DNA sequence: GGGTTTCCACTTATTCAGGCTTTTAG
DNA sequence: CCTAAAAGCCTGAATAAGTGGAAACC
């Protein structure tokens, strides 16, 4: 069905994609190892249409269930990876994942000249995999006795355009309706909230949202060793003037588009001050009940 | 072929999204 | 007061990332 704008695709890939390089013990293989290179996205079943739309925009990849509640798009067929490369050359990633893309690209070169069927090339793929995502397993590191660096250039890039932002937000965004309980008259204060969430590794990008969108603040959380950030907009005039117009003009994808639409409906109610009456408050309540985790 | 590529079922780790309450601003 | 905006928690699952196994094939 619908194809996806390329910058929206890149922004959603910055959010939900991952590159992959398997180096597998294989006794039937000449060098003792077989490889598989590619790029993949795993989403909840409700958003399978996105994967099919990506599959039809690029015309590559295979779709399969990933457990009971999720579905994946996986591109590993070697020739079709040239499409992945051409897309991300023209429409490049901006998060730390760009670093993983560059490794994917180096690994493609190795395999494009058949060097991975030789000892030298497998050894290079191991050095590449060492810096890719979570790196080498203990067994792989010990099977390749040499000083292999795990570090890589930090990525620091700016948001290229609102299309990238809409793809990224379709992955990490949250259009929330906070029903703030109060012993007040009607009691609950309706508060529209926009939020983007990201691991602290892209702090610089998150901070730039405040500059880029003209609003919001950055909150920091952590759970044990794991830290992340939330960009959060609460002032309704910023939501109604600076946030809703961006996504009206750069359309979201997936079920989160429906969530943003309902969110706008509540924004209208709030604008009309109708959120201060039992009728508007009850309409808001049913709208919130039927969106996000109630969808 | 016979190594090698590709695909499909499935799993494990954590970074997200999200629903919630309390406090302050104006 | 009254309402809007900010501060803030923190859980658990939709992600990210990865593996086992075998068919397909060049
Ligand atoms: Ca992400
Ligand atoms: Ca294919
Ligand atoms: Ca191929
Ligand atoms: Ca998402
Ligand atoms: Ca973990
Ligand atoms: Ca805070």
Q: Would you give an account of this structure?
A:
The protein has eleven helices and eight strands. It is α+β, with helices and mostly antiparallel strands and 295 residues long. The chain has two domains: 138 residues, Endonuclease I-creI (Roll), CATH 3.10.28; 122 residues, Homing endonucleases (Endonuclease I-creI, Roll). A four-stranded antiparallel sheet has the order 1-2-4-3. Helix 4 packs antiparallel against helix 5, helix 9 crosses helix 10 and helix 10 runs antiparallel to helix 11. The longest helix is centred in the C-terminal third of the chain and has 17 residues. The chain is elongated, with a radius of gyration of 22 Å. Bound molecules: calcium ion (6 copies). One calcium ion binds next to loops. The chain binds a DNA duplex (26 and 26 nucleotides) through strand 1, strand 2, strand 3, strand 5 and strand 6. It is classed as dna binding protein/dna. The entry lists the keywords meganuclease, structure prediction, protein engineering, DNA BINDING PROTEIN-DNA complex. It forms a trimeric assembly. The entry is titled "One of a series of engineered variants of I-OnuI meganuclease targeting altered DNA target sequence".
């Amino acid at each position: 069905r619908e194809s996806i704008n390329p910058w929206i695709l890149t922004g959603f890939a910055d959010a939900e994609g991952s590159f992959l390089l398997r180096i597998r013990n294989n006794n039937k293989s000449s060098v003792g190892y077989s490889t598989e290179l590619g790029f993949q996205i795993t989403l909840h079943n409700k958003d399978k249409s996105i994967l099919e739309n990506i599959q039809s925009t690029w015309k590559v990849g295979v779709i399969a269930n990933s457990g009971d509640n999720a579905v994946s798009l996986k591109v590993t067929r070697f020739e079709d990876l040239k499409v992945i490369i051409d897309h991300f050359e023209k429409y490049p990633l901006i998060t730390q994942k760009l670093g993983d893309y560059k490794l994917f690209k180096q690994a493609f070169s190795v395999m494009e000249n058949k060097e991975h069927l030789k000892e030298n090339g497998i050894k290079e793929l191991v050095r590449i995999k060492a810096k890719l995502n979570w790196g080498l397993t203990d067994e792989l590191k010990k099977a390749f006795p040499e000083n292999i660096s795990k570090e890589r250039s930090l990525i620091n890039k700016n948001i290229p355009n609102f299309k990238w932002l809409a793809g990224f937000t379709s992955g990490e965004g949250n259009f929330g309706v906070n029903l703030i309980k109060s012993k007040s008259k009607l009691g609950v204060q309706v508060q529209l909230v926009f939020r983007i969430t990201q691991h602290i590794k892209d702090k610089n990008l998150m901070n730039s949202l405040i500059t880029y969108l003209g609003c919001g603040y950055i909150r920091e959380y952590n759970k044990s060793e794991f830290s992340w950030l939330a960009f959060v907009v609460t002032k309704f005039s910023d939501i109604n003037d600076k946030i809703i117009p961006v996504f009206q003009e750069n359309t979201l994808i997936g079920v989160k588009l429906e969530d943003f639409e309902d969110w706008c409906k509540v924004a209208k109610l709030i604008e009309e001050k109708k959120h201060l009456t039992e009728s508007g408050l009850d309409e808001i309540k049913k709208i919130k009940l039927n969106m996000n985790k109630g969808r």
